[PDB]
């Protein structure tokens, strides 16, 4: 789970 | 599970691509996983369109060249009914008008499966039984930018604050002993000139290094 940052 | 896995050797992986100056790594990670699952289903390796995902998946919560998430991309392909080929919908590294064409679709998915968060053994079971797996990682370091060879290990890596999507295409180990000097085989989207022909070996079973098993998933085809 990782919505802290978008995966640019 | 096998001591090592390398899906590139079985025809599941397209040549390395380059996102250039666009924050679309999430789109390349998603197309890489869908390319592997479509090949597992049909025996045909077809390069898929990242630009279709950049231009069309804002409703699902992606932001094109400003970032996005692989699970939101697999959601778009499910809701949309298809995804165009790379050849038919070329990559230009800028946000453009959605030009999805159903007649050019070469892939579909019914949703996706998530790997248990933070579990490197669950990720190892998915890589071994399914094919390449989308994963997020902490790539925010000059050690990664200038990585060239060997097992990558960065003390300053985070397992929870991740900024880049990549594709785990296998795992392996150095030497005779399969239980030490382990690594994840990771395909990047910075071109074949970056890293080791566009790939990087990330330390494996070293406490989820750089977050590789924190937010892993794959499409259901
Ligand atoms: Cl995701």
Numbering used by the authors:
A (entry chain PA): 450 to 457
B (entry chain AA): 1 to 221
Lines from the paper:
Addressing the elusive specificity of cysteine cathepsins, which in contrast to caspases and trypsin-like proteases lack strict specificity determining P1 pocket, calls for innovative approaches. Hence, we set out to determine the crystal structures of cathepsin complexes with representative peptides of cleaved substrates. As a working model, cathepsin V was chosen because of the resolution of diffracting crystals (up to 1.3 Å) and crystal packing with accessible active site cleft. Reactive site mutants C25A and C25S of cathepsin V were used in structural studies.
The pattern II group (binding shifted to the non-primed side) consisted of structures of nine protected peptides and one non-protected peptide that all bound uncleaved into the non-primed sites. Electron density maps of the peptides enabled the unambiguous interpretation of residues from P3–P1. The nitrogen of the amide protection group at the peptide C-terminus was bound approximately 3 Å away from the ND of catalytic H164. The amide likely shared a hydrogen bond with the deprotonated His residue. At P4 and beyond, the features of the electron density maps became weaker and less precise; however, it was possible to model the peptides KPKKKTK, RLSAKP, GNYKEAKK, and EVCKKKK up to P8 in the averaged kick Fo-Fc omit maps. MPD molecules were bound to the primed sites of all structures.
